[PDB]
Design an enzyme around this catalytic site. Structure first.
Site, PDB file in Angstrom:
ATOM      1  CB  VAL A 183      -1.011   0.152   1.149  1.00 57.97           C
ATOM      2  CG1 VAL A 183      -2.181  -1.055   1.046  1.00 57.97           C
ATOM      3  CG2 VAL A 183      -0.188  -0.009   2.642  1.00 57.97           C
ATOM      4  CB  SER A 184       0.444   4.502  -1.261  1.00 59.67           C
ATOM      5  OG  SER A 184      -1.155   4.303  -1.444  1.00 59.67           O
ATOM      6  CB  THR A 185      -1.621   5.535   3.114  1.00 57.99           C
ATOM      7  OG1 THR A 185      -1.319   6.325   2.273  1.00 57.99           O
ATOM      8  CG2 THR A 185      -1.091   6.220   4.315  1.00 57.99           C
ATOM      9  CB  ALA A 187       4.963   4.473   3.405  1.00 55.51           C
TER      10      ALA A 187
END
Lengths: 116, 114, 117, 122
Positions: free
Chosen positions: B8-10, B34
Site C-alpha cells: 500500500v501507499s498508506t 509507504a
C-alpha cells in the site's frame, strides 16, 4: 452477481459464457449490424459488485470510443469486466489501460484492412 | 512454491485476505507500506519455478517502471507473478504481451521527459 | 485555418502564449477553465481546419471524453495536433497513438489519486 | 541520405500516387525504390542505405504486405541504423512514438502466434 455479454456465431459465445458459469437469465446478447437492446438491458440491471464476462474485447463496444465509454460507465457503477479469450479484466487501473491500448490497436487493424 | 506480496501507499488487510483466499500460506505473505522491507525478505526465500501472487497490477511497484523491473528480475530467476484480480500470470503468452506493452509505455514516458 | 484550444489561471496563460508562439492567431484561440470555449470552437471550425493543443491532457476531462471529441471533430473533417506529444489525429495511426497516450496519462492520474485518497 | 519506398499489391494507380508523394516530400527520383507484389526494389534499397539514412514511405500500410511483415522490415532497417518516416501518419520509427508503436504491435502479433500454437499443440 455474475453476468455474461455476447455479440455478433453467437452460440460459440453463449456456450462459452455458460461454461464459464454464467446462468442463462444473466446472459444478454445483441445481433449487431436496435444493435444495443441486450447491452442496454445489461447496463440497466447491473449493480455495484457485479461481474460481466465477455468472450472477446471486440464484442463489447462497436468501436474503441464506444468501448471506452462502456468501461467508464461500468467502472462508475462498481462493475468489473473480464474478457475470457483476451485473458484480461478491467479490475485495476493498469488493467483498464491495457484494455484501452488493445482496443485502439484492434481498431487500427480494422481501419487498415478497410482502406486496403 | 506459492508466495504472496501486498503493498500500500498508506488498508493492507484487503490484499492479504485475497492472498490467503487464493491459497497462499500466512508465512509466505510479505507486505510493504509507504519501503522495500517485505519485498527484500521475499527475494531471499523464492526459488526457480515459484509463483508470487499479487492482488492487482496496481499493487506491485511504486510506478509502472518499478513494477516492470520487479517482474523482469523475478523472471530472470525463473519466478513468475500472478495478479489475482486482473487474472494475469507473467509466464503466460498474455502476461508476456502485457509486460511488453507496459515496458513500451514506460520507455515512452522516459524518452518523453528527455 | 489554424485554431487553438486550451483547458485547465497561470497554467492557462502559459498554454495561450504557447499556442500564439506556435502560430495561432489570438482570435482563433479558445479556452476553458466547463466547455464554453469548446462550444465556441465547435461553431467557428470548418472542414480542413486544424486545432492545436499544447498537451494531450488538455483536450478532454478523461479518455472517454477525449476520444469522443476526436471522433466528433474528425467527422467534421477537422484534425487535432498535439504540440508537446508530437502527434496529430490526421490518420488512423495518429488516432491510435493518441488513444494510447491518453490511456497512459489517465492511468498515471488514477495512480496519483489513489496514493492521495 | 534520403530515400523513398513505394509498394503495391497490383494497383499501378496507387504506386504513382506514392512515387509522386515521395518526390513532393523531397526524395530524389533516383532514390525511390518500388515493388509490385516482389521485394525487387526493397532488395536494391537495402544495398544503398547506411547508418543515419532515412526512408520515406507514404503510409504505414505501404511498407509490408501485412503488419507482421512491416514490423520485421522496420526492425531490420533499425538494426542498420536506418529509420523510416511515414508521411501521412507523421511518425518516425526512431522517435519515442514510433518505437512505442512498433513494440506494442510486435507484442500483439507475438501473442496471436502464441495463441495459434496453443490451439495447434492441444
Amino acid at each position: 452477481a455474475l453476468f455474461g455479454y455476447a455479440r455478433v456465431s453467437l452460440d460459440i459465445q453463449v456456450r462459452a459464457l455458460k461454461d464459464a458459469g454464467v446462468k442463462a437469465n444473466r446472459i444478454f446478447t445483441d445481433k449487431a449490424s436496435s444493435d444495443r437492446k441486450g447491452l442496454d438491458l445489461l447496463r440497466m440491471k447491473v449493480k455495484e459488485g457485479d461481474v460481466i464476462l465477455v468472450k472477446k474485447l471486440d464484442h463489447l463496444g462497436r468501436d474503441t470510443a464506444d468501448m471506452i465509454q462502456l468501461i467508464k460507465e461500468f467502472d462508475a457503477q462498481g462493475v468489473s469486466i473480464r474478457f475470457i479469450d483476451d485473458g484480461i479484466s478491467t479490475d485495476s487501473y493498469i488493467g483498464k489501460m491495457v484494455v484501452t491500448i488493445l482496443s485502439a490497436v484492434a481498431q487500427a487493424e480494422r481501419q487498415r484492412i478497410l482502406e486496403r
